A paper describes a structure:
One mutant, the M11 mutant with mutations R47L/E64G/F81I/F87V/E143G/L188Q/Y198C/E267V/ H285Y/G415S has shown to be highly active and able to metabolize a diverse set of drug compounds. In biocatalyst design the M11 mutant has served as template of further BM3 variants. To analyze the possible effect of ligand binding to the promiscuous BM3 M11 variant, we present here the crystal structure of the M11 mutant of CYP BM3 in complex with dithiothreitol (DTT).
In contrast to our previous crystallographic study, the observed electron densities in the active sites close to the heme iron in all four chains in our current structure reveal the presence of DTT. As found by Capoferri et al., a DTT molecule is observed to form a disulfide bridge between the Cys198 residues in chain A and B. Due to the unobserved loop regions in chain C and D, this disulfide bridge is not found here. From a comparison with the Soret maxima reported by Sono et al. in their studies on binding of sulfur-containing compounds to P450cam, this confirms the possibility of heme iron coordination by DTT as observed in our crystal structure and it indicates that DTT coordinates in its anionic form to Fe. Our crystal structure indicates that binding of a DTT ligand to M11 does not significantly alter the protein conformation, which underlines the use of the structure of this promiscuous enzyme for modeling purposes. Docking and molecular dynamics simulations also suggest that the monovalent DTT anion can adopt a heme iron-coordinating binding pose, in which no specific interactions between DTT and the active-site residues are observed.
Numbering used by the authors:
A (entry chain A): 3 to 457
B (entry chain B): 5 to 456
Amino acid sequence: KEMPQPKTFGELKNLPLLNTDKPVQALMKIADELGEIFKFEAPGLVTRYLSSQRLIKEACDGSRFDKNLSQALKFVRDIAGDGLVTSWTHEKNWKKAHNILLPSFSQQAMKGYHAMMVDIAVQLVQKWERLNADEHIEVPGDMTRLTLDTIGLCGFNYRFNSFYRDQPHPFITSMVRALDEAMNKQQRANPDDPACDENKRQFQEDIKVMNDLVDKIIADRKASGEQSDDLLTHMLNGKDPETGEPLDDENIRYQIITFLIAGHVTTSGLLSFALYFLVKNPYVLQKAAEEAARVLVDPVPSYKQVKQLKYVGMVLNEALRLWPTAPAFSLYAKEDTVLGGEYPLEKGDELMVLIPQLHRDKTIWGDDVEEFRPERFENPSAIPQHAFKPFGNGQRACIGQQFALHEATLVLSMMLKHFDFEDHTNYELDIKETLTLKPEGFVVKAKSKKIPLGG
Amino acid sequence: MPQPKTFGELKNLPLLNTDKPVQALMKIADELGEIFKFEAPGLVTRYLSSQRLIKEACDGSRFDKNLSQALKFVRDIAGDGLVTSWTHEKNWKKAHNILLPSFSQQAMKGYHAMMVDIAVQLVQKWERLNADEHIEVPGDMTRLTLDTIGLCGFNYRFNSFYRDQPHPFITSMVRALDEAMNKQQRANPDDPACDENKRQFQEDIKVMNDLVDKIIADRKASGEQSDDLLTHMLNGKDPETGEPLDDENIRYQIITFLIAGHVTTSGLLSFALYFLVKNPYVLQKAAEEAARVLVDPVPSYKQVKQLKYVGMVLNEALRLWPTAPAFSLYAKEDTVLGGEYPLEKGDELMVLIPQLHRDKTIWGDDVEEFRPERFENPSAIPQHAFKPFGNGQRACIGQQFALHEATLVLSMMLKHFDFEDHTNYELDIKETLTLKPEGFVVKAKSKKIPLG
Ligand code: HEM
Ligand code: HEM
Ligand SMILES: [Cl-]
Ligand SMILES: [Cl-]
Ligand SMILES: [Cl-]
Ligand SMILES: [Cl-]
Ligand SMILES: [Cl-]
Ligand SMILES: [Cl-]
Ligand SMILES: [Cl-]
Ligand SMILES: [Cl-]
Ligand SMILES: [Cl-]
Ligand SMILES: [Cl-]
Ligand SMILES: [Cl-]
C-alpha cells in the first residue's frame, strides 16, 4: 500500500506543519485524518508515525527494530550526553550504565527509597495544610517541587528544598529553557544559520546552570561521611559485570543530569494530569479517596500499604493512557523488512510511536477512548501486548517505571486522604509541550480533612 | 560542472552560514576555479569568476539582469525601483528614461558646489579634532555620502555631521539590509520564532519611509526652485509613453537612491583610504597630485577631472573590493556558456566581482597588490575584465556621480591631512550585501591649509 502523508511545502516537505508550540497534539490530529500510519518528511528527516496497536506490536519486536534517537533526543544529547536516555543501544556506555544502575530499581532498592519519598510527600501535604482561606494550589509547580526533591533525595542524598522556594528551582528554569530550545530547534531546517548564535549561547548558559548543580551534588557526596547505597553510590562505585569497568567521570556527570531530568519531569506531569482527571470526574475521585482512607490507616504510609492501593494505580495508568507524559519514542529497522504486511522498510528506516494515538486505538479500548475510567485497568492481564506503552519498549524501556508509579501512588493517595479538592476555576485543559506534556495553568483549591501526619 | 560540498537536502546552503558569505564564496572560487554550481532549498545558480566566462554572461543579447535572492528580499524595501525591478518591468525603463538626465555632464556640473559643501564639512570636522582623538572612517564616509545624495538629489540636509551617532535612517537601513542578507540562510522563514525579525524589519522600513515622507513634504512646501533628481521623479514624463512615475514608484525611487546613492560610495572611500595608509608610497603620489591640482581654496569641477592618479586609486580599490560585490543574470534562451556548459532558458548566473578582479590571465600574478598604475592606460584593459558598476543597460546609473564625489573628497582629504594607521588596523570586511572595512580608524594630522 502507498503510505499516507500530510501536506507538503516544496523542499521543506512536512516541516511547516510543526511550526507550532504543540507539535505532538498537531501530530495526533494528522493521525486522526490519515490513520494508523503516515510518512513525515523534513529536510534531513524521514520518519513514519504509527498509531495502531496492530502496527506498533511489530515495531516493538526487538529482533527487528532498535531504539532510535529522534532529532529531539539528538539535541538533548547536548545536555545529557551518552546517558541512558540519549545513548544508542550499541554505544558502550548504554549497556554498561544499564547493568551498573539497574540494581538501584530493584524491590529492595524501592523499599529503601520509601521513607525518603514519604519525607517529601509530607512536605507537600504540609504546604497545602498551611494555606489560608481562598488561597489555591498551582498544581504542576507543586508536583515539580515534589518530584525533583524526591529524585534528589532518593537518588543523590541531596536536598533541593524546592518547598522552601516561592518560585521554581533555578535548575528547573534552565532545564525548561534548554529542552524548549531542543523542541524549537527541530523546526530550524538550517540550525547553523548565523542568526541562531544567541539561542546557542543561551542554550549553553542553561546547560551550565544544570551542571553547576551536578557539581554541587558530586562535591557533597565526596565530602559526606554517610553510608549511602543510592543511585549515585552505584554510579561512583558500581562495576559492569561484563567488562569489570566503572563509569568514567564524564559519563557519571551525564547520568546525574539524565536522572535529575528524567527522574522527575514526566512524573510531575502524570500527577498533574491524574489530579486533573480526578477533579473532572468526582465519582472517580471519591472512589480513589475511599481506597486511600481504607488502606492508609497510619499517620504515614508504609511500603506494603502503597502496594495495596490498587485503584489509585488504575487512576495513574488511565491518566497515562490519555496523556502519556513522554508521548513518543523512535525506532529504526535493523534489517530490510515489511511492516503490517503492507509497508516495505529498508534497513535504517525510522518509526515514531505516537503513544497518545496508540492509547486511543478503538479496536483495543472500545468506542469511549476519550473518556476517563480507571476501570479499564481492572484486569491488566486482559490488555493486549503493546497496547499500553507509556514507559517505552524492550530493553530500552523506562528504568524508572516502578520508581515513578510508587512515588505517584504514594503522593496521590496521601493527597486524597488528607484533602477534598475543588476545580474552582472550571479549568480548561491546556497541554504545554516541552518534549514532555503537562496541564499548564492547572489550579485547584484544597479543603483539609484535618487528619494529622507523623514521621 | 564543479560544485562544492553538499549537506543532504540542504545542498550547499550550510557553506554560507557565515557573516561574510561573499568572502566564503571567493574561497570556494579559489578551490574550484572559474565556475561552480551552488544549490540550496529553492535555489540554483552558477558563480562565475573568470573574464573568459563573464564576458559571455555580459552579452545582453543572451543574458538579462536577474534578481538574486538577495535583491528579491530588498524588493520588500525598494519595491520596483531601478535597482530591484526586472528589466521587463514597465517601471524600470520608464524610470530609467526619466531619471537618466539627472546624471548628465550638465547635471554633474550643478551637483559640484553641493558636493563641496558636504566635503568641506568633513574636512572641518577632522580639522577640529583634539590631539588625543581619532577618526572612525566608515562612519564619517557615511555621514558625507548620505548627506551628498540628500542635498544633490533631493535638496535636503540630513546634517549627519551635527550628529555624534549614525543617522537613524542609517541604523534602520543597515538593520533592514542585514535582515535581507540573513534571510538567504533562513530556510523555514514562517516559523513563529521569526515573528520578531519580521516586526523589526517592518519597523526599520517605516523609519526609512518616514524620511521619505519628510523629503516629499519639504519639496512640496519649498518656495525655492530645484532641478534635481526629485524634480525629475515628480515632473519627468516618459518620452516613450508621455506619463510620469506614479506616487508608489516615486517613493521606491527615493528609497532606492538614498541607499544606492551613498552606501557603496562610503565603502569605496573607506577602502581607498585603507589601501593608501597600507601603501604609503601610493598615498604620497596621490597626495602630491592633489596638492598639484587643487590650487584653489576649494576644488572646481574642472580640477576634479584632472585628478587622474586619485581616479586610478579609486579604480584599484574597486578592483580589490568592489563594494557591490555581485550581480546576477539569467539566460534569455537555451544557450551554451564557454563552449561546455549548456544552460536552459531562465538559468541563473552570479558574477563574483572580487574574483573576476583577481583573474591572473588579465591582471598578472600580483593580483593581491594595490597598484593604481594598473589603470594608467584604461584602453588596454580587456572588455568585461573590470565590472564594479555592473553591466549593460542595467549598469550603475550613478557611476559618474560616485566617482566624482569620491575623487573630490579623497583629494581634499589628502590635500589637507597626513594620515596615520595608528592601530595597525587589520582588515575586517563586514558584509551587509555591500562591503566595508569595519572598525577602520586613523589619526589625521592637519597640514593647516585654509579652506574657502
Ligand atoms: C510517569 C513517569 C515516566 C514516564 C511516562 C516515562 C517514560 C519513559 C519512556 C517512554 C522511555 C523510553 C524512551 C525512548 O524509548 O526513547 C523512558 C526511558 C527512560 N526513563 Fe522514564 N519515564 C517516567 C519516569 C522515569 C523515572 C522516575 C526515571 C528515573 C528515576 C526515569 C528514567 C528513565 C531512563 C534512565 C530511561 C532510559 C532507559 C534506557 O534506555 O536504558 N523515567 N521513560
Ligand atoms: C562606488 C560606488 C557604487 C558602486 C560600486 C555601484 C555599483 C552598482 C552595481 C554593481 C550595479 C548593478 C546591480 C545589478 O546588476 O544588480 C548598480 C546599479 C545601480 N546603481 Fe550603483 N554603484 C555605486 C554608486 C551609485 C550611486 C552614487 C548611485 C546614485 C546616485 C547609484 C545608483 C544605482 C542605481 C539606480 C542602479 C540601478 C540602475 C538600473 O538598473 O537601472 N549607484 N550599481
Ligand atoms: Cl531554518
Ligand atoms: Cl556513597
Ligand atoms: Cl475527563
Ligand atoms: Cl516492553
Ligand atoms: Cl528489546
Ligand atoms: Cl503550569
Ligand atoms: Cl510591469
Ligand atoms: Cl594592501
Ligand atoms: Cl607602499
Ligand atoms: Cl544590456
Ligand atoms: Cl565601521
